[PDB]
Write a protein that binds this DNA or RNA. Structure first.
Lengths: 88, 135, 131
RNA sequence: UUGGGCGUAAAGCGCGCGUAGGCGGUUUUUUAAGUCUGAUGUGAAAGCCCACGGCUCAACCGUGGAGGGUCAUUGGAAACUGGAAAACUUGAGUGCAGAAGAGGAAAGUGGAAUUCCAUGUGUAGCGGUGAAAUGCGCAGAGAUAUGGAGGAACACCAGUGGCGAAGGCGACUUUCUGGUCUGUAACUGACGCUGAUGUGCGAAAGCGUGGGGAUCAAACAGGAUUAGAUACCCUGGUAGUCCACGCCGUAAACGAUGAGUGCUAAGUGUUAGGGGGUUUCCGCCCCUUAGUGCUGCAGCUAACGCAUUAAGCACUCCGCCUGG
RNA sequence: UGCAUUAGCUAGUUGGUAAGGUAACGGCUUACCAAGGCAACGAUGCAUAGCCGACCUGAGAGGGUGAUCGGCCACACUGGA
């Protein structure tokens, strides 16, 4: 569903530190482009319902990282809200 | 349960539907409504007087009466005792007290109180059945 | 995602007390080691021992019994929980098994016991009715 | 609450996923808020502690503190909670090396069959029957093969196999994928669970469309049996069937066990990954993980039966139940 | 007190802006401004009932009566001034 070099591509351009995989921002382009994959990939297969909750259950797995971005350091949350496009 | 959700929903107690529903009810005669004042005995007047067969295998014919109370509720009321003054239209007094092995009828008829006198030929049950104490 | 530390730790003792064990341990904290000290301060077990590992090291128990192959620890139960934090008054504080158990007391006087709070004239957060 | 149950007795929707809510791993330091105490004021009149007085006893009325030991005016104490500042990673996610498939939506290859029309063929029966018959037979009925077609699926590999939350998933070759799992465990520093709302799936049948009536088949039909028919017997045959195109929202959707975490006798196969010793001419023995199964302590219940794929011993949340 | 087999409640309402006028307060009414404020923690509405002390039985956890007997509220054929 997601290839190895592509996550290891986004750790070059969006990591918080070195060996920082599992970051809040390192599952946003991993999330929403793989949405945009399955948004077109289930546009092909209109009954790909199990692959539908595959990305929606990790919406919250990124959202809880956005939730964790509040309490520790809020300037990183002003940074990461304004970094890319995520509403609310 | 949880004591957390017991705050969210308390232990509401259970109700008890009480026997004799015709004795805890009055009648607002001015407004056609009903009061609830739990008489010992509410008086009434007979409409029908008959008897009934116990459906349990005990065999007799026990005498009952279709009485309408003050609050005009029609009952089937057991008439205890042997002889009576209950042909029709006797303005009688009615207790509770179910007679078992007899469906529907669950009310007694107060002997010797309102318009009947009690039965005569009793000598071991004299205080009941309207008999004054001898000599 | 366990919520009561001092109860699952206490029932693990009774988990091996049933099958007659003589040697177990438990993880540590600021409290739970000193909680385990008040057991061996009274000396219900042989000796509760040292904390060793990186995070919450195992501190031993060494269950001490009677000579008729018996057990001493009858009854093991924490009364408080996340959701119900219970407290005690010093003036009407009872006696576990009417004088045959112990009942510890937890406040900012140091975590004390039944003798150590009846003549301290403080109550606190009671835990164990162990007899 | 103290002081109840949810496998078969009444108590889990069909499963989920999920909004709120509740409740959450681990280890340090601040407050004294919550905790718990100490100085008083201090809580009500017949009612209410203890002892007298008044009543002939008494019924029935006062006394003396107790006195609040609960609320306020007041001092405080931080383990544990509330907030304040950190970390660890088991738990979870993002990594890496691989296994498997009936996991959903799309394109091919071929087999075999019931039905048809035709050849050859031939002529008395062929089919159907527990018992015979209706029927189909003189047109050649079926038959019969190199070979002509259709409907629809695709035994073999097929399993207390595997995958899916569940309804479920099966000739395959390929497309797009889901997801499972192991191992190394690199990293974020608990990022979790329940799950009201909501959203889905939702088996079969039923409301309808286009391929459907090839086979099957409600409804209907025929023949007799049988003491009784058209019932048990039999076919023909309608939608419904098959699939695609709309759903309805229901099942013994049951493992009759809600979901997440600790701990306590075993043996026994088996599915995938890692671990090997001999080796084997790919096989013997054995460690481990996740499981798939079968027997079986302590504990359990009313007993059945459960016992690492708990109904045992503990914690958290939701929901449900209390006679028919 | 209970009912979601009562969920969306309010529009002088919701805050403020000036006059009153009260022993004083203001949306209390009047001219102005934004739709706000109130809500599933069930506002709204319905139905029911004076409240408390007190009674009473409960091991305590307590909760049911009010003729009592006291303290407070409301009423005086009805409805207004």
């Amino acid at each position: 569903a997601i290839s190895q070099e592509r996550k290891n591509e986004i750790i070059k351009e969006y990591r918080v530190h070195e060996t920082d995989t599992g970051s809040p921002e390192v599952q946003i382009a991993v999330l929403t482009a793989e949405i945009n994959a399955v948004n077109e990939h289930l546009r092909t297969h209109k009954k790909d319902h199990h692959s539908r909750r595959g990305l929606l259950k990790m919406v919250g797995r990124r959202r809880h990282l956005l939730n964790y971005l509040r309490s520790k350091d809020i300037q990183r949350y002003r940074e990461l809200i304004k970094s890319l496009g995520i509403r609310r | 349960p949880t004591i957390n959700q017991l705050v969210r929903k308390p232990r509401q107690s259970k109700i008890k539907k009480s026997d004799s529903p015709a004795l805890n009810k009055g009648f607002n005669s001015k407004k056609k409504k009903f009061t609830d004042l739990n008489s010992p005995q509410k008086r009434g007047v007979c409409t029908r007087v008959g008897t009934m067969t116990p459906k349990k295998p005990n065999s007799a014919l026990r005498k009952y009466a279709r009485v309408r109370l003050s609050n005009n509720i029609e009952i089937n009321a057991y008439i205890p005792g042997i002889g009576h003054n209950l042909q029709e239209h006797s303005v009688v007094l009615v207790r509770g007290g179910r007679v078992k092995d007899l469906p529907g009828v669950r009310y007694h008829i107060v002997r010797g109180a309102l318009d009947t006198s009690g039965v005569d030929g009793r000598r071991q049950g004299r205080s009941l059945y309207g008999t004054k104490k001898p000599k | 995602t366990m919520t009561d530390p001092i109860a699952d730790m206490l029932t693990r003792v009774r988990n091996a007390n049933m099958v007659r064990h003589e040697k177990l341990e438990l993880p540590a904290s600021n409290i739970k080691k000193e909680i385990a000290e008040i057991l061996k301060s009274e000396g219900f077990i042989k000796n509760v021992e040292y904390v060793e590992d990186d995070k919450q090291g195992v501190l031993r128990l060494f269950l001490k019994y009677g000579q008729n192959d018996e057990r001493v620890i009858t009854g093991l139960k924490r009364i408080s929980k996340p959701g119900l934090r219970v407290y005690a008054k010093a003036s009407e504080m009872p006696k576990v098994l009417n004088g045959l158990g112990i009942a510890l007391v937890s406040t900012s006087e140091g975590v004390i016991t039944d003798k150590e709070a009846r003549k301290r004239n403080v109550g606190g957060e009671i835990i164990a009715y162990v007899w």
